[PDB]
C-alpha cells in the first residue's frame, strides 16, 4: 500500500497517450492519479512512454542526482513528457494546472524495488 515503485507509476506513468491532450490534460490527470485529494500537488511530470521503456532508464546513463546521490540515470534518448504545474491562481480544492508538453531526456532515481 504504496511501495516506492507503484507510487512512481501512479504519479508519472501515462503510456495511454503519446502526448498531452490539450490544455486540460493536467487538470484531469492530476485529478485521476489522486494528486489533489488532500492538497494540490504543485508540480508533477507524466511520461508518455511504455512502462518497460521507462524502467530501462535504470540501465542507461548514470549521473549524480540533484542532492548528490549516485543512483540517478539519464535516458539516452528523448521521451514525450508532460509538465504539470500549479498556476499562480490555484487554490485547494480547486487546483488549476498549466499543462506543458515536451520531448526530453528524463533523469530518474532507481533502487531495487
Amino acid at each position: 500500500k504504496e511501495t516506492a515503485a507503484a507510487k512512481f507509476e501512479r504519479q508519472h506513468m501515462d503510456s495511454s497517450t503519446s502526448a498531452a491532450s490539450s490544455s486540460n490534460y493536467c487538470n484531469q490527470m492530476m485529478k485521476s492519479r489522486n494528486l489533489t485529494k488532500d492538497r494540490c500537488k504543485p508540480v508533477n511530470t507524466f511520461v508518455h512512454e511504455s512502462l518497460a521503456d521507462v524502467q530501462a532508464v535504470c540501465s542507461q546513463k548514470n549521473v549524480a542526482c540533484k542532492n548528490g546521490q549516485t543512483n540517478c540515470y539519464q535516458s539516452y534518448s528523448t521521451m514525450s513528457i508532460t509538465d504539470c504545474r500549479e498556476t499562480g491562481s490555484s487554490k485547494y480544492p480547486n487546483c488549476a494546472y498549466k499543462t506543458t508538453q515536451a520531448n526530453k531526456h528524463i533523469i530518474v532515481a532507481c533502487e531495487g524495488n
Binding site: 516506492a4 515503485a5 511530470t45 509538465d83 532507481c110 531495487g112
Partner: peptide, 11 residues
C-alpha cells in the same frame, strides 16, 4: 531489476 522510484528531472 532496479526500477524508477523518483522523477528527478527533464533533460
Amino acid at each position: 531489476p532496479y526500477v524508477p522510484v523518483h522523477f528527478n528531472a527533464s533533460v
